Every structure is written in C-alpha cells, then in structure tokens.
Amino acid sequence: MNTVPFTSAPIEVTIGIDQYSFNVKENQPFHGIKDIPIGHVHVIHFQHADNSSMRYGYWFDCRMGNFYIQYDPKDGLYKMMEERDGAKFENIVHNFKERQMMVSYPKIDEDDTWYNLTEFVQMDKIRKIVRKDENQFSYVDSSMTTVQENELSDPAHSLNYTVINFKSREAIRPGHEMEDFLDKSYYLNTVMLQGIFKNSSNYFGELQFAFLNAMFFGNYGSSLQWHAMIELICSSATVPKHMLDKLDEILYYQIKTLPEQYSDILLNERVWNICLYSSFQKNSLHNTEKIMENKYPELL
Amino acid sequence: GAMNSSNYAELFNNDIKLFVDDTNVYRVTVHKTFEGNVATKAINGCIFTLNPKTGHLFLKIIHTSVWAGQKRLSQLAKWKTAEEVSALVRSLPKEEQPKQIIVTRKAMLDPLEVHMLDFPNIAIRPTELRLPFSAAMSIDKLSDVVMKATEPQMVLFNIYDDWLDRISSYTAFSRLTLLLRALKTNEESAKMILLSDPTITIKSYHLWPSFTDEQWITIESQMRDLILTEYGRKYNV
C-alpha cells in the first residue's frame, strides 16, 4: 500500500482520491493519504474552498516513484512532486503515519469500482495524452482543451486525445461515402483499432481516461471524447463480440459511478438515445441500457 | 449559414452558386398487386441543379436502372444526388466550380458535405426559402427528356430562355419561381395560362413561350391570380 504525503494544507480544499473525497480546513494538520492500492493508476484532485474554479489534479502510479504534494503560494495550487531519496521519503511517511496525520484510502474489500473504471487505463498511455515528459505523473484540470477543440491554443497544456471526426477524409473512403457515413466499421476497425490504437485495450483505456477527466474535473473536451468513442462503436455494424461485451461493462460502471446531480452536464442526450435505441448496437448493451433506464429515464 | 429573405440579393452576386433540388430524383407510382398488397414502380427522375444568376440548369436524368436491386431507395436517392453533384463539380473547370451549393431540403446536407470533403472551400448551405423546384417536371420539355431517357444522361438547359437579354437575374428568378409555384399549385390552370393562346409559341431552343415584355406582365398577373384563387379555394377564404 503506497502513500502520498502532503507537506501541509495551507488553504481549505476538497481533496479527491479516485472516486473518494474529503474536505480539509485551512491549516488543518493534514499530511496526506496512505494505504493507496498498488496495481492501479490513481488520481489525486483538488477543488479550493475559496475558488471552486479550476478543479485540477494529478494522475500517478505509486509503482513509478515516490510522490508527495506541496502547496505553492506563488502559483496558488497543490503541486505533485517526486522525491528521488527513498530513505528521506520513507522517514517522512513513517513520521506522519506514527502521528496519524494521514487519511486512509477507504476501499471496501468487496468493492471493485475503481478497477472497473480503470481496467484499461495505463500511466504510459496517460503520459502520451498529457505531454510533460520530465514528470512521471500527469496534471489535468477543468479548463485544458483537447487537440481537436484547438483545431476548431497553447499546445503544451492540451489533452492529446485521438481526433475522431465522422465528417473527415480519415473517416470516409472516397467511393464509399454512404457506406462509411452510415456504417462506421471501416473507421472503427481499420483506421482506429488496427491503425492508431493497435488494439481494443488501448481504445478502451483512452475512453475510460476521457470519462474520468470529464467526471473528476468537469473537463468538457474529455466529455466530448468519451461520447465520440462510444458513438464510434455503437455506429459500427461490425464490432468484435468481446469488444461489445466489454463496452457494456465499461459503460455500466461509468453510469453507476456518475453523480446523479451531474447527469445533465455529463451525459449527451443525442448520443445516448442514438446508441441505446437507434444504432447497430442498440441491443448489444443490455447492462448499460438497464442502468440508464432505471437511473436517468428523463435523459431517454 | 442558411440562405433566407435577409440575404436574397446574394443569389445574384458574382460568386458562382448552385441550387440543388432532389425532390424528383426518386419518383414512384403506388399500385395494388394481384394478391392485393401494394407495390411501387419507379419512373425516371432527375436532379435539378440550377445557377440562379445565369439560368444554367444541369438536369441529371436518373434512370430507373440505378434503383435495381437496391434497398432503402429514399435514403439512397439522397446519396446518389450528392454523388452526382460531386461528379458535376469535379467535371467543371476550376473557374466554373461553385463557391456555394444551396440544397432545397436539409436532408441533403450530410450526404453532400460527405461527398464534397475534397472541396472544403465550397460551402454547403440549407435555405429557409420554400422554392417550387419540385414543379420542374411540369415544364413539358424537361418532363419529355426525363421520360424518354433509356440510360443515365445529363442535359443542359437555360431555364430563363433569353430573358436575361431584357431583365436582371433577380427579375428572371422571380419570374421562374412565380411560374413554378403556379404550376405546383394548379398545373392544368398554369399550362392553360401559358399555352392557351396559339399565336404565341415556344421557340425550338426555349422552354417557355415567346412573350413580349407587356405579355409577360399579363402572364405574371394571371399566375399571381391563380395562386391567390387557389389559396382561397384551399382555405375557403
């Protein structure tokens, strides 16, 4: 179980760790998060009490290094940093553990929620979407634009999601206009899976990462990407059966975790109605269809 | 964006543009079968592609053979339309290519946009105008070339005859839409108005009769009377 110590908490903040969240008071003796499960990526996220603008946070994997959080009073945010001195880091963590100055990652033994949301998400793929090669962790916030959004402007602070555009020469073979526009299988299987992602696991990893950035940061571009990647599969007549069955699992857990009161900002009515009731795959997403109809019947 | 009453003069500026109307591409008769089911029989159709400034009409005749063994014909007709407009643009020299293509029905936007991806500088626009181009097949010479076709064919017309020698393109378009609206509203009454008087004929090389300027004023008033008369008959007003 790994640990992310905090130097201090000088400003009142809501701290997220994965799907959990805790309020910390201004100058409360808070020194971090312990018992973080090894084997998953994690996200540690912030929303300041005195300015709820910029949600921001850091994706990390405690297998890749020893990470801590320090508040920067100049840039006004909690920054993740890596400690290269293992013995220093162990000594600090031991001190804070003995003083009981850390919250414990509150995982229920039965509960696979986080694994179910991050099954295909790898740090190495996050670091290609979020480009800052000098750090082993990745900063995301509410306002970061996607390479696609920037096309339609600081490229270094951008989310390099794979561009999906149904009315692009990439999506439509000259001579197969009607075919490729009404059936996205070409675009899904040849261009995206065989060509860019190489396999369904990379595709699902990026879809799952897009959803989590949409949910944890209210990142609008991420929400666009999540729905585009769902619609691309649902709009394809020819999809490997394993991929459809896996997508239904993926989406079920995403819809299960979404805060009910964010459904109006996080769910696109057109896409979901198309995917569940009109698309080639309208009858392929039984679990997702049942949770959507029971939890969000007003959207449908 | 969309072409409306606000931007009507734009139709007659020096930017090449085409209207595309697909309402006569897929045409059927509906009939009973021997078992008392219903079946459709396709008849030859056409794409109506018009330059409103010059009157040049690119009439692509859609021969019934293009539907043979095809499904979802109403959907296919839109994509065939877009395919043929795309092929027409590619056939034209660069300096003759349109800068805008205005579709009369919004269902043509996606098909045409997808077929014109290679032309990102040609704008594909809808219109809020209710244009009576469906009545093209009430123009006897256009109906005749469509019905006689035994294979796919493009025929070129000037839908304004020689009117632009005497009137502006704004006025020519106004006269065309009035004639087509009248033919759409009461075809038999409109053709009587146009063809009643045997001393005024249609030149071999024309679509419409050889009215003098004063006769055009009379005809135009008779067409407006017809449309009003028919609106009164429709609404009992």
From Swiss-Prot, chain A:
The modification Phosphothreonine is found at residue 257. It is found in: Cytoplasm; Nucleus. Phosphorylated on serine and tyrosine residues. The modification Phosphoserine is found at residue 236. Residues 244-265 are annotated as: Leucine-zipper. GO terms for cellular component: cytoplasm; U5 snRNP. Changing residue 236 to A: No effect on interaction with PRP8. Keywords: Cytoplasm, mRNA processing, mRNA splicing, Nucleus, Phosphoprotein. GO terms for biological process: spliceosomal snRNP assembly; spliceosomal tri-snRNP complex assembly. InterPro entries: AAR2, AAR2_C, AAR2_C_sf, Aar2_N, AAR2_N_sf. Belongs to the AAR2 family. Present with 7330 molecules/cell in log phase SD medium. Heterodimer. Interacts with PRP8 (via RNase H homology domain and MPN domain), competing with BRR2 for the same binding site. Component of a U5 snRNP complex that contains at least the U5 snRNA, PRP8, SNU114, AAR2, SMB1, SMD1, SMD2, SMD3, SME1, SMX2 and SMX3, but is not a component of the U4/U6-U5 tri-snRNP complex. Component of the U5 snRNP complex that is required for spliceosome assembly and for pre-mRNA splicing. Involved in splicing pre-mRNA of the A1 cistron and other genes that are important for cell growth. This is A1 cistron-splicing factor AAR2. It comes from Saccharomyces cerevisiae (strain ATCC 204508 / S288c) (Baker's yeast). The lineage of its organism: Eukaryota, Fungi, Dikarya, Ascomycota, Saccharomycotina. The gene is AAR2.
From Swiss-Prot, chain B:
Coiled coil: none annotated. It comes from the Eukaryota. Residues 7-237 are annotated as: RNase H homology domain. The MPN (JAB/Mov34) domain has structural similarity with deubiquitinating enzymes, but lacks the residues that would bind the catalytic metal ion. Contains a region with structural similarity to reverse transcriptase, presenting the classical thumb, fingers and palm architecture, but lacks enzyme activity, since the essential metal-binding residues are not conserved. Functions as a scaffold that mediates the ordered assembly of spliceosomal proteins and snRNAs. Required for association of BRR2 with the spliceosomal U5 snRNP, and the subsequent assembly of the U4/U6-U5 tri-snRNP complex. Functions as a scaffold that positions spliceosomal U2, U5 and U6 snRNAs at splice sites on pre-mRNA substrates, so that splicing can occur. Interacts with both the 5' and the 3' splice site, as well as the branch region. Has a role in branch site-3' splice site selection. Associates with the branch site-3' splice 3'-exon region. Also has a role in cell cycle. Present with 468 molecules/cell in log phase SD medium. This is Pre-mRNA-splicing factor 8. It comes from Saccharomyces cerevisiae (strain ATCC 204508 / S288c). The lineage of its organism: Eukaryota, Fungi, Dikarya, Ascomycota, Saccharomycotina. The gene is PRP8. The chain holds residues 1836 to 2069 of 2413 of the full protein.
